Design a protein around this nucleic acid. Structure first.
Lengths: 82, 106, 97, 100, 100, 82, 106, 97
DNA sequence: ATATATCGATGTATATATCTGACACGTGCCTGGAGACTAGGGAGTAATCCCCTTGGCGGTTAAAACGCGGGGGACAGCGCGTACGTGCGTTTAAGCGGTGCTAGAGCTGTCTACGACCAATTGAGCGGCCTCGGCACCGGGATTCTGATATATATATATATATA
DNA sequence: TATATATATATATATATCAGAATCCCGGTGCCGAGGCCGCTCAATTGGTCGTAGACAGCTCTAGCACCGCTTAAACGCACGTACGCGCTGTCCCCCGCGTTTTAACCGCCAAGGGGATTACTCCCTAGTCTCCAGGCACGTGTCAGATATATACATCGATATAT
């Protein structure tokens, strides 16, 4: 039982990420597409990590599954575990 | 008696790398000079990365390497950026840069 | 009653740091990042040496396979610097046998 | 008198110079955790997550979005603009290859 | 009488519709073979090449250049132009990640 | 004993490759940069293929070495050898 | 007597895939059901690509599959194009796809 | 006086083609392309199954590793169609033993 | 004065022979795949526990949401020179076809150095605890920019003045 | 009365100056994370045995390189015209900066409880070895779909004479 939580990724959060990316002015329709793109990226990574958790016969998606799911997509994550 | 790392003059472990090459099923017969060569290459790469990280730490007036220092050291260099292009560093940053068009005109 | 024996390159990275910088410490997360970097370089070079072993209908990984893997993976100055480093380390191994 | 009010563009430059030099998590932790659990319950119901898994997803998502915004900014400056628009994002995702 | 001369743009569209339908290698074989031998003799003197290696290099180079021209054309249409420019090529190679 | 052979990559051939790419008009400065880009791509692929050649104690470059060099860079080539 | 590819109802060989999994140094031991599962997946992927290539060859009134028919069959399909992303088909071609801006104004 | 044996999937691809399209042939270059495609699919699934068996501290590639590797690499409807095909082939094997 | 229907012309695809080189099919054989027994070791099943995850409550508080004034950027339009397409004639150079030849690739026999394996042992590495110094936080001063403003500064003009 | 020159004055603009926020930097305190020490434990090391994979040469055969000649198709350069990219201007709208209000995230503490990791037993599933035999691959031959040539119907593109 949940709600629509993609509205929780607020307008200042996308604003701060875009400032870190280094942009000066942001159009008003950036935010909806940024939410859609983030949802697509998470539906890739989370699906691969959940498959990794399925194969181990576990229920806790650990950090290693997320690192391997990111490594399979060519976005290697140094940091957690390794 | 004498460990193979000390005999080869390195500090990365030779026996552990030999075990990981044998039991990481890369090929059937892992040779003798292979773990020494691999440990030397890995030790050189770590020495280069830690030297640039220590330079970035001294330039930032800190005496302990944080992940931002590693991000700065890797991306301020060019050939390490070619090596580590596809990797992101956790709790790192981006290089401080901005395009000249966005800067206010004088 | 410990949990498990976890294997890591932390002591060796600290020894390399104290040769390079005698007075610079390192945080835990930076050590974990560097451990991941060392293991990623290891898996890259080992996978390329395995590919070179299979490609020539050979069944071993000698020093030449790892030298060629370093030449394929490492770009530019790093490639020949690491090849010279590994060559003098293998020479120092064999002469001390 | 009138208050000391900045021109449009100075505060954006200051925020660029500030957020590029600090390394915090720009997205809040709890709404991202709720978003991750909402997406993850579609595949396998009744899952559990470590804190480090949600942290790894947050660092990866922020890094991917910052790289995408960098390429979107270069697309916008290429079209003789300073304002990033959605068509810059579809151009960047098309050139990168994520638009299947 | 005045000759029947096509407008600037019709012959270009016909060549687009013709070369997208064809299959054959557009670059001539012998100058590409000379180029491959010139580049290869820097790494190792007195090299030999199989014919299938040179045709593999030609097919790979042609496919890479055609894909780069598709991305460059998308960049050019993005900036309200129909003429591709060198800055479109640098933008496409920068977003692709090929800029060393 | 050679010459300057990058001018053999001829402006009609860049034009035909761009027609296959789907381009209506070509600027006059595309050709020099296209020669430079092709030279960079060949200097990568031929270098990796020649390294594959010198590993195997061979003095000729087979099609398989070029396929392995292209597969290493991400441009997987079905066709020749495989 | 009965070969394992005929026993499982497939056409791709089970024994050859078992050998290539065995002395392809992927793992120390290989289970019995793994070559059959892998041969079935490989046969399904081949049958799908030959189905679309035969359709594309019959669309151009040719009774022999050339590389261009395979090129059309892969890039017209959605999941097959997503799977073979970086794959270059030799002596293939490109899809006929011209942008609407480049078309002449009527 | 033959030179060497060359192992290839050509006759198997021809059998699958004649069970799919009974009146359509295939060129030699198309056979080489699909030989390369079949070998590339085999290499991808075998490498992912090896990596999956290694990450769980397991030492046997069973059919479950192949199923999870197929669900990882293949996108969309191809994944579920391939795992249904593989499951009924393994079931036919076990019944016909 | 501008949109509309002819019509000359140019490229495209179609019909049909042909001849052809590439593909489908018959044959040996030898190589790898299959049946059967051994033997052993990896992996599933059962109980434990404790570790970590989830759920809930309170609380200050930083931050998001909303609204408003306005300034600067995006978009549309006009103008225009230029840079590129298109066509034509010519000449260069690639494609093709033989021919030698010769250097390098593959097979083969052998034998030699080298890596797998087993057992014992010990020295290095990892977990746990302490203790201490580098980093985090807070407050004040200096600085370093940004924004609005008075000053003077060049420019167009209307009248005074000199000449005819 | 007509024509030509000069200059104070009003006006739109470059520039030094002054005030206001934001940020850096310095210092004091404290706090918590990293370095160092100690015990355990496990895996690297060494010696001897043995199988085997890879190096040396030598033979052969095959395919890659160099050369020559014919042909002819494509590139190169020149000329001309036109459509398009750049640039300026007007405007209009749409983000941005700022202030007030509310609210939901962060932090911390506590309880329950579900599942990940551990240990042991066993069992069944797979490697190894042998040994036979069917399948697949190289090779040679028929044969048939496809490329090329000549002729032709037709889509279509642009220049133009006409209607409202």
């Amino acid at each position: 039982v949940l709600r629509d939580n993609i509205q929780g990724i607020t307008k200042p959060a996308i604003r701060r990420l875009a400032r870190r990316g280094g942009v000066k002015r942001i159009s008003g329709l950036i935010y909806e597409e940024t939410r859609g793109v983030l949802k697509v990226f998470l539906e890739n990574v989370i699906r691969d990590a959940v498959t990794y958790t399925e194969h181990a016969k576990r229920k806790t998606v650990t950090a290693m599954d997320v690192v391997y799911a990111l490594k399979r997509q060519g976005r290697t994550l140094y940091g957690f575990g390794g | 008696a004498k460990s193979r790392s000390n005999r080869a003059g390195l500090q990365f472990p030779v026996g552990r790398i030999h075990r990981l090459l044998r039991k990481g099923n890369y090929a059937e017969r892992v040779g003798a000079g292979a773990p020494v060569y691999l440990a030397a290459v890995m030790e050189y790469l770590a020495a280069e990365v830690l030297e640039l990280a220590g330079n970035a730490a001294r330039d930032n007036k800190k005496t302990r390497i944080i992940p931002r220092h590693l991000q700065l050291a890797i991306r301020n260099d060019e050939e390490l950026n070619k090596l580590l292009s596809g990797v992101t560093i956790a709790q790192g940053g981006v290089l401080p840069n901005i395009q000249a068009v966005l800067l206010p005109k004088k | 009653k410990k949990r498990k024996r976890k294997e890591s390159y932390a002591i060796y990275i600290y020894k390399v740091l104290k040769q390079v910088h005698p007075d610079t410490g390192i945080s835990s997360k930076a050590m974990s990042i560097m451990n991941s970097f060392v293991n990623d370089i290891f898996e890259r070079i080992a996978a390329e040496a395995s590919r070179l072993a299979h490609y020539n209908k050979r069944s071993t990984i000698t020093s030449r396979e790892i030298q060629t893997a370093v030449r394929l993976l490492l770009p530019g100055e790093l490639a020949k610097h690491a090849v010279s480093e590994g060559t003098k380390a293998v020479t120092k191994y064999t002469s001390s046998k | 008198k009138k208050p000391h009010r900045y021109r449009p563009g100075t505060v954006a430059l200051r925020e660029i110079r500030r957020y590029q030099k600090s390394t915090e998590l720009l997205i809040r932790k709890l709404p991202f955790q709720r978003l991750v659990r909402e997406i993850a319950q579609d595949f396998k119901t009744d899952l559990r997550f470590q804190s480090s898994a949600v942290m790894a997803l947050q660092e990866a998502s922020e890094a991917y979005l910052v790289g995408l915004f960098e390429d979107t900014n270069l697309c916008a400056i290429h079209a003789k603009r300073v304002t990033i628009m959605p068509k810059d994002i579809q151009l960047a995702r098309r050139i990168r290859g994520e638009r299947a």
